[PDB]
Amino acid sequence: MPREIITLQLGQCGNQIGFEFWKQLCAEHGISPEGIVEEFATEGTDRKDVFFYQADDEHYIPRAVLLDLEPRVIHSILNSPYAKLYNPENIYLSEHGGGAGNNWASGFSQGEKIHEDIFDIIDREADGSDSLEGFVLCHSIAGGTGSGLGSYLLERLNDRYPKKLVQTYSVFPNQDEMSDVVVQPYNSLLTLKRLTQNADCVVVLDNTALNRIATDRLHIQNPSFSQINQLVSTIMSASTTTLRYPGYMNNDLIGLIASLIPTPRLHFLMTGYTPLTTRKTTVLDVMRRLLQPKNVMVSTGRDRQTNHCYIAILNIIQGEVDPTQVHKSLQRIRERKLANFIPWGPASIQVALSRKSPYLPSAHRVSGLMMANHTSISSLFESSCQQYDKLRKREAFLEQFRKEDIFKENFDELDRSREVVQELIDEYHAATR
């Protein structure tokens, strides 16, 4: 049975990233912007049923629901050449173009207001899946809808689908720029609290680090949000490569998660991608490039006090790879202790060799992605906790919270979220110890 995944694209940023992700998937599968299979892609070996639905016209339609509270972005997607890829019945746009205003409380109240409409959409899409594996929520932690409404939806999904996995592709705000939302740390902390209690996986995407990578490695002067989202979509494509190309092992998300996340609370995964470029790559050269810190697209604090360690590493190697060179590279990495692992368990490091899509042109004969669980993410959670504490100590932006029922009396949900994120940082450090 297929293992269908419903992609929920939330707010302007989430919807734009989802649109580019689906465009990338279409290009990898040889699907036209109108949903027609390309002649060169008619005989593809990719399993589309995991992430796409097949229309009656042999059109592959994404199992994607696009939800936005503002019409502008949804209308731009429906006006794009890729409008026919997505099921039109899966796009909800709030006629009340006021949004959540980057306010978690407003997003939550909006999720509550559209609960029935949203759960009706989710149920319609679930019934439209033959063997739905789970839901992937693609949203930003910095917007209004994706944060507030995202937390509301996380709660409602946890109640409604208690047997289905909830994975998130969470876009983290830039840590290096002063957020215009002084309460952004409060909203983010509340969302992190909900991720900690009601989400199975939060992938932190720091726009600050993505901009830094674009400048230092991509030579992008002043990276635009479009370029950051293109990098994000590249990452999402690499994450879906095991879905799009049938392999021999770890062919399902359940098995991937069980291999990568031995501690349910220790579910923060770091990502690594290669090549990151606008030489015959050897298995050893690939692994060496993947291991360079300068290629990680997430701004985690280098706390010198916490001896962060790897919990698990997955190397997805795409292209003509000699498995014997993979084995030799793993052996050399182990012998050389080139990576620090969690001290309380054996190092779970898997390497999957896969072929590229025959329909997608690959400039690189060999690429590699590293997924690493590393305790230095605690430095990011610590930074978030410090930002929360900095705002809460100033009661900043609390006048709008006191207007909202979740924050009408106090900000205790924000303070509890800041506490939980501090505890998370400390637990990541203990797992570093």
Add this chain to the structure above:
Amino acid sequence: MPREIITLQLGQCGNQIGFEFWKQLCAEHGISPEGIVEEFATEGTDRKDVFFYQADDEHYIPRAVLLDLEPRVIHSILNSPYAKLYNPENIYLSEHGGGAGNNWASGFSQGEKIHEDIFDIIDREADGSDSLEGFVLCHSIAGGTGSGLGSYLLERLNDRYPKKLVQTYSVFPNQDEMSDVVVQPYNSLLTLKRLTQNADCVVVLDNTALNRIATDRLHIQNPSFSQINQLVSTIMSASTTTLRYPGYMNNDLIGLIASLIPTPRLHFLMTGYTPLTTRKTTVLDVMRRLLQPKNVMVSTGRDRQTNHCYIAILNIIQGEVDPTQVHKSLQRIRERKLANFIPWGPASIQVALSRKSPYLPSAHRVSGLMMANHTSISSLFESSCQQYDKLRKREAFLEQFRKEDIFKENFDELDRSREVVQELIDEYHAATR
């Protein structure tokens, strides 16, 4: 395991010598200025991991750090065809492009100003070296940048790596020309102090002797510093031949040093190169030329009062050499007593047989480098001390030192340098007895 060597090019003279050294190494290994192995150089017998790093694009990049307190030389390197050879992340350049102005105290203050950048670079290179053998600092003792910053770096390397060898190519000033730096003798004494206390081996490069050799042997009318540095680069390429051609014996720097330096303070080595030319040289003809004063590349005063002597000589002969002729040449040299060795220890005369580079066209079947420990080097250290005493007795060029913290209050660092160089001279004389 690789045996990495870091090349440090210090100040105008050190950086120019480092640039010409890297050019010579590149020419010997057939490596392009961008670090890519030339097709004719793909099959080289050189071990690049010792001195070059291999980039992800199969480029071999020299493990060379160019440090100057004045922008002129670094900018000249970055404007040279070899700008791509060096890792840009390994280059620290002081933003104050004023240099030390031929002031030892100013060079020291500049080393203090760029201390963090330098030790960050050194640590980065050490972590990027699998089995870093050591650092070779190429600097001048008489300038400002190369002298002050060179002594500072020698001290800091001796402190951080007190069990690792620190080799220097220390350029001794011309004794026959009026130094433009009236404090140059002070700088020279301070550098001699640092060589005596914190270096295991100092290769003395006398600009007077280099000019003399370039004129008499290269037929260079008015030899330029560039021509002297070209001779130096030829010497450095010949010096790396035992690294580049794998042999059966003396495959490490430790064995060379242990054979050459029986007394840690008596670590001043003179260099000699042959041929010096713009006939099948026999082992016996080589040894006769080496014993010929016209082939020594160091200007030592013929003091008639001090019976200076050779402590040890190593001839590394590269090219098509008959080992039976080498043995016969050693026998003939012994029978003729062409060199006087220390009587209280065995005569250290080493001969290394090496093959010439297949990638470099050699008109000469055999070339040779001589490294010699000879007691007349004490005459060079005495000359430097006497020049220091001549300046100090006149308080010459002290106004710029008094501006620098090391010389603002007193010249005790100069007096200690004079003492250290006196102790070195006296130890060389005792080793002569």
